[PDB]
């Protein structure tokens, strides 16, 4: 009740729309706030794309070593890693790491294309038992985050459950699960988001997202000191098309639900 009041107060002060789902594996409990509403995933969808490639690799041993050409025509709006590799190749492992750890747009698009496109990523989610996730578009258009638009959305509840399956459950084989967790623990983009609301000693693997309407997102697997792990999804979006980022809102939500 108090956690619910605190999240409602945070949402009101922020001016936007906040979605939270925490799974605490200590006691199999959840803390939910707008957890069945849809939110634009933005960058957070790259976990599903990378997981689809990892799943494909379970029946294609050297898949992660497969080379992918990077060309000027592949560049999109945010290419921090791929821009360094234009006119050469990157492996699927390198693209997965760039997508997950730097939010590289080109890398996401190569993962999407490899597995057959947005509808194939969505079909993979369905195979896992996630009937909420939808990836409709590639980068950069999947980030538009227009209010009322269901494209490229999921709910906090569904994303938390799916992230739990991918990182702590059995969606992926042991090698592939460990690889996903290692990639997420090496993320470089999340220090101001969920991590900023947790004690410094806790270990986090996370994936952020951002987009139009000031959309600011983070999804995380969290190992608190000497405790069972948590899964936390914090999704946030705002009324104005050109609203600025609000990573502090995600940090505040994380602090509220883990205090
Ligand atoms: Cl505006
Ligand atoms: Na989206």
Numbering used by the authors: 28 to 286
Report text from the authors:
CTX-M-15 (cefotaximase-Munich-15) is a class A extended-spectrum β-lactamase (ESBL) capable of hydrolyzing penicillins and cephalosporins, including third- and fourth-generation cephalosporins such as ceftazidime and cefepime, respectively. It is predominantly plasmid mediated, disseminated worldwide, and encountered in diverse Gram-negative pathogens, mostly Enterobacterales, but occasionally also in nonfermenters. CTX-M-15, like other class A SBLs, employs an acylation-deacylation mechanism to hydrolyze β-lactam antibiotics, utilizing four invariant residues: Ser70, Lys73, Ser130, and Glu166. In this study, ultrahigh-resolution X-ray crystal structures and mass spectrometry revealed the mechanism of PAS inhibition of CTX-M-15, an extended-spectrum β-lactamase (ESBL) globally disseminated among Enterobacterales.
To investigate the process of cross-link formation, we obtained structures from cocrystals of enmetazobactam and tazobactam with CTX-M-15E166Q, a conservative mutant in which Glu166 is replaced by an isosteric Gln, such that deacylation of the acylenzyme formed during β-lactam hydrolysis is impaired. Cocrystals were harvested 72 h (enmetazobactam) or 3 weeks (tazobactam) after setup (and within 24 h of their appearance, as with native enzyme) and diffracted to a resolution of 1.42 Å or 0.91 Å, respectively. Importantly, difference electron density maps from both the enmetazobactam and tazobactam cocrystals reveal the presence of a lysinoalanine cross-link between Ser70 and Lys73. Conversely, Gln166 is present in two conformations (occupancies, 0.57/0.43) in the CTX-M-15E166Q:tazobactam cocrystal but not in the cocrystal structure with enmetazobactam. Asn132 in the CTX-M-15E166Q:tazobactam cocrystal structure could be modeled in three conformations (occupancies, 0.49/0.27/0.24), possibly as a result of the dual conformation of Gln166 but also reflecting the extremely high resolution of this structure, allowing detection of all three conformations. Asn170 is in the same conformation in the CTX-M-15E166Q:enmetazobactam and CTX-M-15E166Q:tazobactam cocrystals as in uncomplexed wild-type CTX-M-15, with no evidence of the dual conformation observed in uncomplexed CTX-M-15E166Q. The Ser70 -Lys73 cross-link is therefore present in all four cocrystal structures presented here, with a newly formed d-alanine at position 70 in each case. Despite these minor differences, however, the structures clearly demonstrate that cross-link formation is independent of Glu166-mediated deacylation.
